[PDB]
Design a protein around this ligand. Structure first.
Ligand SMILES: [Mg+2]
Ligand SMILES: [Mg+2]
Ligand SMILES: [Mg+2]
Ligand SMILES: [Mg+2]
Lengths: 132, 177, 205, 215, 110
RNA sequence: CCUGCGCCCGCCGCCCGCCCCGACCCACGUUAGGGGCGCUUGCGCCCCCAAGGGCCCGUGCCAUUGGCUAAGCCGGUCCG
RNA sequence: GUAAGCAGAACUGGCGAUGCGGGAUGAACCGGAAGCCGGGUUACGGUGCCCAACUGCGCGCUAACCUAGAACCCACAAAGG
RNA sequence: GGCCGGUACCCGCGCGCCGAAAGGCGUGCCCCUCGGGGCACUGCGCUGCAACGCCCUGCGGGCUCUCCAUCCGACCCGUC
């Protein structure tokens, strides 16, 4: 068994180019390489499977839907928040936040993480001494 | 974005002469990379078909044609005349693509690959949209099915931009389809 | 290929399943750049083209010997470590001081001889079999090639790698246990710190 | 608007206004004044053989250096060269010579109120509220060296003797730093954690790419 | 690593000296080639273009109280598609200089 | 075996010369699959894309003066 | 002349008299003709390592159990399966 | 951001004030009419850009002289 197929409606992360990180719905496949991606801010266009990383979410739509139908299907399947909250998209969100930390916030993160490290170290030593 | 071909239509006629003071008018639909190449191809076809040369001809109009619905996939047919190494032949080619403009690119690439025929050797006799349920080629016909599903057998592992790529990486990548 | 530019004193390469010539060009440029590399488990380097093709390539290579003095001619090596060192020398300019200083930085081994067990063994993505050979095309392991061109240590590497694998497995189990107790420590300190640790909520995973 | 500024400056009428030929039509009646014949010294002490050329009192009046967009009075810089590299300081005001004027403050950083070139500083995105620091007393003469004569070659009896004695920085600068660091700690305690921040120094530890790193 | 001796701040981004501006058969020793640790794009060197470097080496004899010498230069312009830069030095580097490490500060900064 | 006026070895008191600037990181294995934790040891839950991650006072003019010093960490060193 | 890196002519250019970049190597093949330097950009040709530049973005065909094949001249292959 | 130049004319400066300083400051016509803009009458003379460093008989500076190492180039001259 495979867990993930290129099929109508499946949402895919775009993983290369100037549009890295967008979700796009594969609404139709051109041929064994190219498919149509429909997006809320991006108009339906073909893009190549080499540049798409398939995701875990499927939305249950028709082929080449009307844009309003696709948007309401994105709402009913809740792809934005599910993608954001799952670990894969949280990786991208956290990665862009670490991109957007400046010097002083980076310093406060350093402080908080030194104190976290000390706390974990002390707690681990205590529980390791409780372990016999 | 950019397309390597553009379907122009070129309209031309012979120069005025004392008899036939309005020489008759010829229209053509030519693929090329730009204006000047489309024009130079137009005089080719009206000098090997209609006996008119650029010196003794005159070009009146050249338009660049565009496509109606760039957002939808359209099964395209191309009837094309080509030169092999030892003669000429006639091919029929069915493609699925969002534009005829992209189908022509795909078709030159296919003739340069399957037959080592270059562009200077290829003629597009007739182009048309051969809508579904009337396509002839199997590779076109096999994408005519909703409820289609297939996994990706071939997926390059590659960092999103050239910045994120380094030469050593600790973990062997996890590939799964 | 211009190099990674990385800063390690030594960079090791777990050369299991990498294309010989591709690993060889990447490593050769690292050497020429001057960063000291050490390639291990060379007995595993996969080579495109079937085993019979690589065989006949090497047995053509055996014919090439200096007529009037074979002791002076092309020195045919058998062990996979030396096969790799020769394949990399063919890519480094080894008749100048720069090139010989480059090869001075290369150390290739069969297996993983100490002190290269307790270390992270880095793989080069641009050369792995999975990423460069279509699944279903012929390939051969330089270990099998040398085992059949007359390297008489395929067995002796094999017992030593069985021993090294079991000695690694026991320690990996130990580190699983240590990491699950570090994870219970991870959450135990987090629950003991409240607003002290809000700033790490948005950049953690 | 560099080129619009070029034309607006280049107009003949606007050049009349800028050179201010009115108020030169004011003083000498209704006309532009005559000029006369100076240099009636008529007392050359010595006659050079080479064709003589006088000293250049330079009449070109160069523009002032433009302080970077990301510099605000109160911005926490990053020193980059010299003995205070990595030191984080607070920018007081870009003084009249063009150089920046920064402070540690010396109570926390060891960086006194000192002059720093704009080239060697990286402005961070943080700011402080210091509109109640009274900085007007600082200028170029405060810092002008009057460097002394080279007859004093530092010898085995000077080496640590200058360290051990105090003929050094003066006490009005001592008291100066007290007044500024007081009125500036009173502005730093406002911003949380900032004293510890400035106490740290910026270090570009491994896995840090400056082109990526914001500030 | 912990409880270590050495420098306590790195205000410079290290790199390798890589060779010279070569054709397939010429060297123009005037412009050296340098790789910065961490740059992987031709537009990432946009931010380094101009920043000044130092080749730091040490001779056989003391001078002015040190063996250390340092020849100064700067990143002129990008070279290639992968963030290699061209470096201009006050004096052209030794060819033993290639393969060694050069210090790229951020002094003339913007 | 190891030069009876020769050398070896330990310690500390340092001087130079080398290297360096966080020069920190043990899994095996496949890739038409795999990984962690629980209980039917078969099935759940979760995670899989790149170490792009983790860890380390990570913050002192390669480091001012004295003093006390928990719990913790790291090093020299004896023991096993 | 069976042909020849042969012998004789027609138009032009080249070498000879000429460096330089490319074709690995070559007097005349490709680019191109020059005082000595600094800066920029190209031609021919290339970007896996030697070797300066992409293991770049795409699409097809080849699987060679003969040394698969890989540069204008150019270092060949034929009839035929 | 890179390389070059640094002023006898092109620019620029004084001949008025305000301004440490970039700079602003007047009259009259034309224009839209906020903002504000266009044009205008023009005169004498002058006319080698700056700031701060470092070294100064030194373990300094740099050398066209010598030796060596490395990189690239590189066949042995005369001659039919
Ligand atoms: Mg030779
Ligand atoms: Mg040039
Ligand atoms: Mg290269
Ligand atoms: Mg003769």
């Amino acid at each position: 068994p495979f867990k993930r197929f290129v099929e109508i409606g499946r949402v895919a992360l775009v993983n290369y180019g100037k549009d890295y990180g967008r979700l796009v719905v594969i609404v139709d496949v051109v041929d064994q390489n190219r498919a149509l991606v429909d997006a809320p801010d991006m108009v339906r266009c073909q893009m190549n499977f080499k540049r798409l990383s398939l995701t875990d979410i499927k939305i249950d739509i028709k082929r080449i839907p009307k844009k309003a139908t696709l948007i309401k299907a994105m709402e009913e399947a809740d792809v934005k928040t599910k993608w954001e909250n799952s670990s894969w998209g949280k990786k991208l969100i956290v990665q862009k936040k670490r991109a957007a930390l400046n010097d002083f916030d980076r310093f406060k993160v350093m402080l908080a993480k030194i104190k976290r490290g000390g706390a974990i170290r002390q707690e681990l030593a205590k529980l390791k001494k409780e372990v016999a | 974005v950019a397309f390597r071909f553009h379907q122009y239509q070129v309209v031309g006629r012979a120069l005025p002469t004392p008899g036939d003071e309005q020489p008759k008018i010829y229209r053509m639909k030519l693929w090329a990379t730009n204006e000047v190449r489309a024009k130079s191809k137009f005089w080719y076809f009206l000098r090997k078909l209609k006996k008119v040369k650029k010196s003794n001809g005159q070009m009146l109009a050249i338009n660049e044609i565009f496509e109606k619905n760039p957002t939808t996939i359209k099964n395209y047919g191309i009837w094309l005349r080509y030169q092999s190494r030892t003669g000429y032949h006639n091919m029929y080619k069915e493609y699925r693509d969002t534009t005829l403009n992209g189908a022509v690119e795909q078709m030159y690439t296919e003739m340069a690959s399957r037959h080592r025929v270059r562009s200077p050797c290829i003629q597009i006799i007739k182009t048309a949209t051969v809508n579904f349920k009337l396509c002839k080629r199997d590779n076109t016909k096999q994408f005519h099915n909703s409820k289609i599903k297939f996994p990706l057998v071939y997926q390059k592992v590659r960092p999103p931009t050239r910045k994120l790529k380094t030469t050593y990486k600790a973990t062997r990548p996890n590939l799964f389809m | 290929v211009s190099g990674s530019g990385v800063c390690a004193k030594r960079v090791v390469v777990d050369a299991r399943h990498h294309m010989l010539g591709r690993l060889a060009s990447i490593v050769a440029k690292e050497l020429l750049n001057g960063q000291r590399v050490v390639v291990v488990r060379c007995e595993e380097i996969c080579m495109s083209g079937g085993l019979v093709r690589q065989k006949m390539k090497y047995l053509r290579f055996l014919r090439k010997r200096m007529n009037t003095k074979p002791s002076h001619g092309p020195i045919h090596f058998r062990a996979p470590a030396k096969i790799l060192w020769r394949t990399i020398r063919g890519m480094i300019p080894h008749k100048t001081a720069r090139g010989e200083a480059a090869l001075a930085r290369l150390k290739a081994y069969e297996g993983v001889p100490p002190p290269y067990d307790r270390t992270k063994r880095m793989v080069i993505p641009d050369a792995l079999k999975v990423l460069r050979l279509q699944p279903g095309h012929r390939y051969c392991l330089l270990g099998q090639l040398s085992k059949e061109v007359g390297w008489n240590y395929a067995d002796t590497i094999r017992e030593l790698e069985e021993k090294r694998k079991e000695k690694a497995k026991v320690s990996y189990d130990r580190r699983k246990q240590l990491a699950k107790l570090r994870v219970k420590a991870e959450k135990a300190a987090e629950e003991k710190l409240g607003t002290q640790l809000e700033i790490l909520a948005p950049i953690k995973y | 608007s560099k080129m619009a500024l070029g034309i607006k400056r280049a107009s003949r009428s606007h050049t009349y206004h800028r050179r201010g030929l009115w108020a030169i039509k004011a003083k000498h009646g209704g006309a532009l004044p005559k000029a006369e014949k100076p240099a009636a010294v008529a007392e050359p002490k010595f006659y050079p053989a080479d064709d003589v050329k006088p000293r250049t009192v330079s009449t070109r009046k160069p523009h002032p250096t433009k302080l970077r967009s990301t510099i605000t009075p109160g911005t926490v810089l990053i020193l980059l060269a010299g003995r205070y590299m990595g030191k984080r300081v607070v920018f007081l005001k870009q003084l009249q010579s063009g150089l920046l004027l920064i402070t540690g403050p010396f109570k926390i950083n060891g960086v006194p109120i000192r002059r720093v070139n704009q080239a060697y500083v990286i402005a961070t995105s943080t700011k402080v509220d210091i509109s109640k620091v009274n900085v007007q007393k600082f200028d170029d003469k405060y810092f002008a060296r009057e460097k002394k004569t080279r007859a004093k070659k530092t010898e085995g009896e000077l080496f640590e003797s200058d360290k051990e004695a105090t003929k050094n920085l003066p006490d009005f600068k001592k008291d100066d730093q007290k007044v500024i660091d007081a009125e500036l700690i009173k502005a730093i305690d406002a911003v949380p954690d900032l004293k510890n921040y400035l106490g740290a120094r910026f270090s570009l530890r491994d896995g840090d790419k400056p082109h990526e790193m914001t500030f | 690593v912990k409880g270590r001796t050495g420098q306590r701040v790195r205000l410079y981004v290290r790199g390798t000296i890589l060779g010279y501006k070569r054709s397939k058969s010429n060297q123009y020793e005037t412009a050296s080639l340098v790789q910065i640790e961490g740059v992987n794009t031709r537009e990432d060197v946009a931010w380094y273009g101009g920043k000044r470097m130092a080749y730091v080496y040490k001779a056989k004899t003391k001078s002015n109280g040190t063996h250390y010498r340092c020849i100064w230069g700067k990143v002129s312009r990008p070279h290639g598609n992968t963030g290699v830069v061209r470096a201009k030095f006050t004096s052209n580097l030794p060819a033993e200089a290639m393969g060694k490490k050069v210090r790229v500060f951020m002094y003339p900064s913007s």
